[PDB]
Structure 1
Amino acid sequence: GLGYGSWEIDPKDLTFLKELGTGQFGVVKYGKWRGQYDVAIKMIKEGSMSEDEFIEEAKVMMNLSHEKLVQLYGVCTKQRPIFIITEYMANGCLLNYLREMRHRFQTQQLLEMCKDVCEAMEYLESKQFLHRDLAARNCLVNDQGVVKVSDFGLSRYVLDDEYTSSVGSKFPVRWSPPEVLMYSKFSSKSDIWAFGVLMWEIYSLGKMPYERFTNSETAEHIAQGLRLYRPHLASEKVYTIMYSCWHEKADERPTFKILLSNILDVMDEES
């Protein structure tokens, strides 16, 4: 209505129902919009984000739409803290979901999680949109067990320097290819590398990549041409797919379209 741009939600239309905890960038709640639509409300703590840049980017993010990508519905920016209003994903963070041994996952379920993420990433790649921090901790799971990609591109607006540079204590070293760790060279191929590490996280039921190493040791391991090795639940064909994401030469890594074709092939062969 009057006073609101197409990317702006009126916070008065929100009903808060449940505290979900603190996610990356701030406190998140479950609620309703206009009494009946389920939403998540992510509250951005003051001083944590480059707010005007994020608001401009939110306009582009609103236009992204894919069934395996968490939908951004709008933002509430007339007050502090600002809110990010998104699709609600009842089963929460993928990393925590993988770590719950009660699920007793079949490998076909794990491969479907990989396919869900790959479809979202093929869509982002088709829009020339980099995720820049793909990992299981940045994927969500809905009430139907569908995994969707979340927090896409958001790292660009984080003000805490410990998260933003390779030399920072909170940088995603374990999901980064050699050219990012050595030279800060981000590209579609650094999202491909990260996707291979995410496939390893899924097939490992949420183990930390390079679980016995520090970040410093991981960077040395990778720079020396060494890699993660095969999770017990991954078949040789699944391992070949994730390993292809880790070629030392970025231009020899597949695209998300190729990875999708490889995953569908294994799904058919392992059906």
Structure 2
Amino acid sequence: YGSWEIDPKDLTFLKELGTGQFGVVKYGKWRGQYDVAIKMIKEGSMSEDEFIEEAKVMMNLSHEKLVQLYGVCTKQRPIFIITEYMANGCLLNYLREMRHRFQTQQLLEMCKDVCEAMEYLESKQFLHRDLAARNCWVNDQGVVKVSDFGLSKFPVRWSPPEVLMYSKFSSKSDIWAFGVLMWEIYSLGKMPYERFTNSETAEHIAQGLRLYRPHLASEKVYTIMYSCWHEKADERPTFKILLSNILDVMDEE
């Protein structure tokens, strides 16, 4: 895999971070110096084809607000995937467990971080398809970054009506999910539509129901997230407009 191939001899394992669909992830060091997350891909947990896929995406997209792949170990089994270390873990857990670290000013900056990542993906004509707090990560500085773009149990609660009825995915379905993610952020990690099932949610949003304004969201912040849920996809903003909107509110906060 060219200069993306890392010598497993240069890795050292320090702490276990947990187990996901594809196996154990550990925190470690690369070449004695760099903090890394090491994903030990469980054999059979994923096909060769599925890995060529993931690798293609990860070595060809790069941005300060996307979790950065550092390399792969493919000359043995199990495969290792080595990525940027996100010391504060998943954003969803962060919102629920680390509330002493942020105020509403920081909640908005979390949204701006994600919005920059998605404006970049939009500029590359690349759809995330599962944007949500569970797929955002927080580093030691509190910076939020997006991961697992295009890796796609269906994320009904983050989906617009045209996805649920027609499988019509576009930049505008990522916009919708981004609105829901801002709702997750300002609700400090509640499940969207927390009293409804998935099936109830799909019927309700088709009939025009929308997520209420979280108490920590100002009217101006709510206007931004609400603009993401226009029933007509072509009336939803772009991520570049959203970013401009968010910066304006941070300047007024």
Q: TM-score, with normalisation over the residues of structure 1?
A: 0.89
Cα deviations by residue, 1:73-98 (Å, 9 ceiling, x for unpaired): 12222233322211001000000000
CA distance in 1, matches of 2:59, 2:75: 18
SS at match of 1:86: strand
CA distance in 1, matches of 2:161, 2:21: 25
CA distance in 2, matches of 1:113, 1:199: 9
CA distance in 2, matches of 1:80, 1:233: 47
CA distance in 2, matches of 1:88, 1:126: 25
Shift, 1:27, TM fit: 1.7
CA distance in 2, matches of 1:131, 1:25: 19
Aligned pair count reads: 253
Cα deviations by residue, 1:219-255 (Å, 9 ceiling, x for unpaired): 1111112111100000111101001111111111111
SS at match of 1:221: helix
Shift, 1:269, TM fit: 1.1
Does 1:200 pair with 2:200? no
Shift, 1:188, TM fit: 0.8
Shift, 1:8, TM fit: 2.1
Residues 36 and 83 in structure 2, CA contact (< 8 A), matched pair in contact too: yes
CA 7–177 in structure 1, closer or farther in 2 if over 3 Å, else same = same
CA distance in 2, matches of 1:140, 1:24: 17
Q: TM-score, with normalisation over the residues of structure 2?
A: 0.95
Shift, 1:189, TM fit: 0.9
Match of 1:151 among 135, 148, 151: 148
Q: Who is 1:159 aligned against?
A: none
CA distance in 2, matches of 1:50, 1:189: 30
CA distance in 1, matches of 2:14, 2:177: 34
Shift, 1:201, TM fit: 0.2
Matches within 5 A, 1:117-266: 117-155=114-152, 170-266=153-249
RMSD: 1.5
Q: Who is 1:61 aligned against?
A: 58
CA 111–230 in structure 1, closer or farther in 2 if over 3 Å, else same = same
Shift, 1:185, TM fit: 1.2
Residues 21 and 45 in structure 2, CA contact (< 8 A), matched pair in contact too: no
